[PDB]
Structures are given as C-alpha cells and as structure tokens.
Amino acid sequence: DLRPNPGANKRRKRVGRGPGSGHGKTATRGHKGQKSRSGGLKDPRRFEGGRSTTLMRLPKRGMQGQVPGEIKRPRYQGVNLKDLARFEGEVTPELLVRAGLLKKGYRLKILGEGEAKPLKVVAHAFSKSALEKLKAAGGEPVLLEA
C-alpha cells in the first residue's frame, strides 16, 4: 500500500468556518450583527448584570484554611474486595499499588460489596462489612502501625 490514499476515513474534515465572505457568514460575520460584539464580552460564566451574581449563596464550607494552611495527615485510600477478587494469593499494599488501584495513597482500607476470596490481606484498616465477609473465608492481620 502507498501514499495514494491513506486518506482519513471520511470523517475528520478540517473545514474550519471561514466567516469572511459574501455567502455563508457575510458582513456581520459569525453570530454578531449588533453591538458590544467587538473586543470581548465581560465573562459571562460567573459574571454580570452588575447586580449581585448568584453570589448570594454562602460559605458554610468552613475550615477554608489558616496561614500555615494544609495540615498533612495520613490520607486513606479505600478499595472494594470485588476488584481485589480479580487475583488471589496473599495481598499487601505493594500488590495493590502494583495492580492499578492504590496510586500511592498509602493508607489502604478494604471495604464494600462484591464477594470475598479466602486469601490473606495486610492493610491499614478494615471496614466492618468487609471484615465480616472476609471472616467467612480466610484470615487477615491489621496495619503495621504507622
């Protein structure tokens, strides 16, 4: 096969609208036709009227922050045991971070629906329901500590 027609399979058409002409998007050019169609409209996203925005709502979202700001803390990443049921042997945060579901969130914590495999599991915490569903299958040690 050769450069005669690898051509894009009849849908990608670069046909950008060229509005300056006598037919298509004549004169006024693009949707304009009036005024205050010049440099640029004020936003409009959040803005305008000049009245009060929707800004009449309010921040209940407290703890917005202090000057030192963010307080670093062990962020807990959860994981359903139905996605854990994909493989079987004896899991540790290493295996979970290797599989695809963890992403170095570090503090692992199995939970949720799905069905339990009788395998073993080390974590940092355990949800009640998961702990029970897995209790009806196999063993499980708690976190390291930190």
Partner 1 sequence: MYQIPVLSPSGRRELAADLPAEINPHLLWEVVRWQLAKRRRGTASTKTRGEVAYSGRKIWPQKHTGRARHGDIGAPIFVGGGVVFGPKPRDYSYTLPKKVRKKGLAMAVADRAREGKLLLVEAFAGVNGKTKEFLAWAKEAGLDGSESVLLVTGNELVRRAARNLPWVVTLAPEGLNVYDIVRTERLVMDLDAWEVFQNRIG
Partner 2 sequence: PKMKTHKGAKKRVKITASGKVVAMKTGKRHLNWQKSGKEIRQKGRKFVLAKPEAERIKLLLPY
Which residues of this protein are in contact with partner 2, per CB under 8 A? 44-46, 54-61, 64
Measured CA to CA, the distance from residue 122 to residue 141 in angstroms comes to: 6
Tell me the torsion sign for CA atoms 134, 127, 145, 87. Answer: positive
Does 63 engage in binding with RNA (CB under 7 A)?
yes
User: Of 7-15, 17-25, 34-42, 120-128, which segment contacts partner 1 by CB under 8 A?
Assistant: 7-15
The three-point CA angle 106-79-131 to 5° equals 105
Scan for tokens 């359903």, then name that residue: 80
Q: Based on CB atoms, which residue is closest to RNA, 15 or 136?
A: 15
Q: How far is the CB of 49 from partner 2 (least distance, A)?
A: 11
Q: How far is the CB of 63 from partner 2 (least distance, A)?
A: 10
In three-state secondary structure terms, 16 is: coil
Q: Based on CB atoms, which residue is closest to RNA, 54 or 115?
A: 54
